[PDB]
A paper describes a structure:
SID1 (systemic RNA interference-defective protein 1) is a transmembrane protein involved in the inter-cellular transport of small non-coding RNA that cause systemic RNAi. In humans, there are two known systemic RNAi defective transmembrane proteins (SIDTs) - hSIDT1 and hSIDT2 – that are implicated in hepatocellular lipid homeostasis, glucose tolerance, insulin secretion, tumor development, cancer chemoresistance, RNA translocation and degradation during autophagy, and activation of innate immunity.
Here, we use single particle cryo-electron microscopy (cryo-EM) to determine the structure of heterologously expressed full-length hSIDT1 at ~3.4 Å. We used HEK293S GnTI− cells for protein expression, excluded CHS during solubilization, and purified the protein in digitonin for final sample vitrification at a sample blotting temperature of 18°C. As a result, our sample is apo hSIDT1 that lacks complex N-glycosylation and is vitrified at higher temperature and pH. hSIDT1 is a dimer where the protomers are related to each other by a 2-fold (C2) rotational symmetry, with the axis of rotation being perpendicular to the plane of the lipid bilayer. Each protomer has an N-terminal β-sheet rich ECD (yellow box) and a C-terminal all α-helical TMD, which can be divided into two parts – the TMD core (blue box) and the lipid binding domain (LBD; gray box). TMs 1–4, along with TMs 10 & 11, form the TMD core of the protein, and TMs 5–9 form the lipid binding domain (LBD). The TMD core is stabilized by four tiers of evolutionarily conserved interactions – the TMD-ECD interface, the TMD disulfides, a metal ion binding site, and a phenylalanine highway. In SIDT1, we notice a similar phenylalanine highway within the pouch formed by TM1, TM3, TM10, and TM11.
Author numbering:
A (entry chain A), B (entry chain B): 42 to 275, 286 to 334, 443 to 591, 598 to 621, 626 to 648, 681 to 819
The structure:
Amino acid sequence: AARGADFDHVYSGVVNLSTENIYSFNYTSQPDQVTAVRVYVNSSSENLNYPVLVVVRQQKEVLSWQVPLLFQGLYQRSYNYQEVSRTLCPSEATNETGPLQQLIFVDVASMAPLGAQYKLLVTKLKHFQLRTNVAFHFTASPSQPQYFLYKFPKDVDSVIIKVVSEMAYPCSVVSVQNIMCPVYDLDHNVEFNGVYQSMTKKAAITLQKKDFPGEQFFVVFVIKPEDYACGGSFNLQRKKNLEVTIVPSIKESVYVKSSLFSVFIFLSFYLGCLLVGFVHYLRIYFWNIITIAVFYALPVIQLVITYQTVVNVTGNQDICYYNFLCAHPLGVLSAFNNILSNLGHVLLGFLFLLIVLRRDILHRRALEAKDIFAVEYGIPKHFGLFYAMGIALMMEGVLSACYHVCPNYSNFQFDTSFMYMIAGLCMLKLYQNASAYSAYASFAVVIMVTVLGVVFVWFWVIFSAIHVLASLALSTQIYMDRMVLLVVGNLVNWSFALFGLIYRPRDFASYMLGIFICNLLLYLAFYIIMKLRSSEKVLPVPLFCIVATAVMWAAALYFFFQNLSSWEGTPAESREKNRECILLDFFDDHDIWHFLSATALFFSFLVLLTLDDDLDVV
Amino acid sequence: AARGADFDHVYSGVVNLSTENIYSFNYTSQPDQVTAVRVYVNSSSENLNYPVLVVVRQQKEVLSWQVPLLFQGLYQRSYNYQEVSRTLCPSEATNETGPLQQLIFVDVASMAPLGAQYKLLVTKLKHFQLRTNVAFHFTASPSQPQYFLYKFPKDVDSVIIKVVSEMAYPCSVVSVQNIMCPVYDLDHNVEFNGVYQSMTKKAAITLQKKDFPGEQFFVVFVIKPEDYACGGSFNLQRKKNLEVTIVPSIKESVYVKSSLFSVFIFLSFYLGCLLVGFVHYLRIYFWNIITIAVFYALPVIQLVITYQTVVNVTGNQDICYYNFLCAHPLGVLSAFNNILSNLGHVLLGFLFLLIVLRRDILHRRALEAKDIFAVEYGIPKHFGLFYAMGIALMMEGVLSACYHVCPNYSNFQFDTSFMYMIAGLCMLKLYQNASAYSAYASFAVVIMVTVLGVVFVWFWVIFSAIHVLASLALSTQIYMDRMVLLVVGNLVNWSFALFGLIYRPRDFASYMLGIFICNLLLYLAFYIIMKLRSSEKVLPVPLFCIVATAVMWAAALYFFFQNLSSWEGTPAESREKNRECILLDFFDDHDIWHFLSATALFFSFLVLLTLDDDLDVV
């Protein structure tokens, strides 16, 4: 019992308590290509107490739905849609089997005393297979989910899928499943299997060839009914216009050609320092700091790899905050362009403990043999702080090379934490004890207290008075021309504190921008303009070094001020600010800061070291 | 078109490509009680290429399934079941509406050239509603999931649901949903809504009355096909015999009657000390430790409340490791019997800084006025360690009262961490500097290194030699009778290290059991048997105190040696060892250790303080 209907035609009729509508669609497959049937069903109006029930029977599948669809959300609201569409599964073919005959049965029924109205349209899909470097243009809906198929090529072993929306809204979920057919297109079971990502404007998924049996996969797009998870708020139709692009990945030569550059650019400094040095006349407090440094590192190297294993096991790519367009994977690590750029700290913090140790050896030898108290400058024994300076670079580099494996909220902002100490020591600038030893750990304690309290009684307005008092206390000791300069510096610090209180950009995230002014104040106390009535204190090598650290600090602020990701306000809003890669397709735009910060801090420390000349001969 | 069949009868027949089987069941509801229809369908044999498809149509629901069910699991295995059963949703009634007429349509069809065989049985449910303090006896299966209904009483505002299996296997999931009917009984969508727990032998769920609209809820039981998540391994039938019990919760009077006891039991010590004291003759290193103590606490009080909020938001009760039969909730906190028992540390660490400060004041006054160098015992100025002893109790109590909000793996075992320092100081026992200051932080560094390295090259065998060397080094300084005692102690320590290496009970969890021997060695060096040829050094008050700290250390080891939970080997195996509550239905069996450890450590420290008598008059 059937009617023998034909494909691509609009059918209408009346259903009742006894009348049932039967349709039978017969089609022949091919020994190649993929076909995909699609059923669209529309209801006229009303029907909120006696809906229409449609069942579709295949050889190895039965599907069923009611036409007046009713969703449900938070805060006791009810949405109702009146249009249903579905994409039936394919059957596939082989080269050893001929053409296949297939039958689809569609039954429509209702349970109403008077009747209902329905419209049926069953059509084949012409464009079902995505190709390499070809962009599509479809349109989704919260009651019309979509899926497509992709086949791996013979040479490509990895693919990046890029999905781009247009306006802002509504949110969606994208999934990557393997080639079977208990296919999951409903919203409540879309997260059961496969890599899935929430997206509101952008999405990027990285896939490999060795993890898929048969080298074919399904990309599934589903639209969220209520945009609550993405951070926003909130009947007739929603609609969405997406765009999907598949691109290949880089080869293996780039992984060598970039690491060779990033390990052959920091030996020219060694060669230069050697050349400059060997041309002359044509020729236990530290011990009690390692035990504290090995206390504040082991929770990081017990939490980070655990989080990485959790992300690499459960499937959810919503726990870490990477840059999803420039995250190259290697091995267990999923970001191998933010762990090889931190190799500058632990290699440029080793030229201090080859020069200042030689200077210590030479000065102690000169004290042992010659009379070092003749024509000297104010107790020449001055070291012991350079050894606690040139090891904080390594203890900042090792601590920075463990945060970029999973940026999250538990790890907080523990990357620019010891840099506050490295820029706020300001002890060796008081050259030529009681209030310094106590304030050494107290400075880092106050910095950590401010960092913790920045997130949580008018913190912005309360900090201006404390900053002004601290600036006045510092300028009282540092400092009439000197009094006028101290007053101008205190006024500038108060104006900067008032401007920061007026701004209040990103609360705890703005702690870096608020302590950059403190670092500038600490690094603007260069007294090189003392030559009004004093000695010369100027030489070509410190003049070149102060020119270099004046020039090379301007460039290192631009890449700081370009924001790429964000650790606040949902994990689906980081993807909007994502950017691509420059400089040989390996380095990011928040990865040329770890190359300039180290080589500016090293030159500033060298300026601090090599200064106070033209007095050893007096 | 129908046949007019009757309830509770076995029907059989043959289906084909053209023949379809229709059944129509008409039933009348009642103005009270709950009915529940249940459909059982059985297939004879074979049918792996042409299955049987069954659809059930109601007024506001359509359900559909194939009879030769096929599941799927990891490692490319395929299971097939031949029996299906389902429980249809109820329709419910009101007191303002009369009896309701309902019709169920059951259609059976196939797509086979020869035929298939099927058996249908549709029956009503007699026992559908659970009652208070009544235990049921049902039987589940991985292809037969179950659900029941419960209604809140008029006085009870909270309920504990206890589910108990029998043997070990197989695992299951239990869910608590609200009263609607898009009911979720399949395995892939059971975790969409509601509180759910994985269970293999035991489960306990706590529910409240203010969170459920209408005061009715659904308890859903579903059996897992593959027992992989619970930790185990791995066709005809599985089967499971459960048991469910609903019990009420305690009143509000217990929350007052226990806190009054647990704050009125620790003032009798104050009254006793006052009475003993006022009866006589009828009458800056510490400053540099607060800055380090406020460094190792803020990640805990940024991670713990975040984890608690995550558990209290997402629904998953599988991230923290509580005792699910003795976890009383109050407010945001879900365990208010492990945060009010840690109030003993921060209240019994305050009787030292009222007695030793008075002794310091009296001794300084006596030095200022009288000649304190007459008839004294070896430089009577001895304090400065009691002030670093009586504040580690508070810095262990505050650090212990933040781990019991969510025991997990990231928090590790950071509860008995400063107790290693508190028991391994052993500095003031060398009475009457160079190697002590260096070894102070080094002892805690070695303890933290051992704790970290215990989890991860024959650690058990390598530690015996290090322990023997450390024991020999300690006994060389501490210590012929003294040499024989030192040799016997070194031999006993080597035997204990060999026994611990032979045992190796729980690796990193066994670090507490392996350092308990070290604590016993440090607290067994009491030289009170020096009276062979020496002075008396014995008085009634230190004799009573050494008797008390000898007696009250035996009882505090039993409750340690009773294990209640475990932080390793899946989060569904902690529930097997769970126990109930003793001592006025509030305190646990791992909560009478925080009351005896403090009052034994305080008496041991008092023994250390008050000793060396009978020499102030000589």
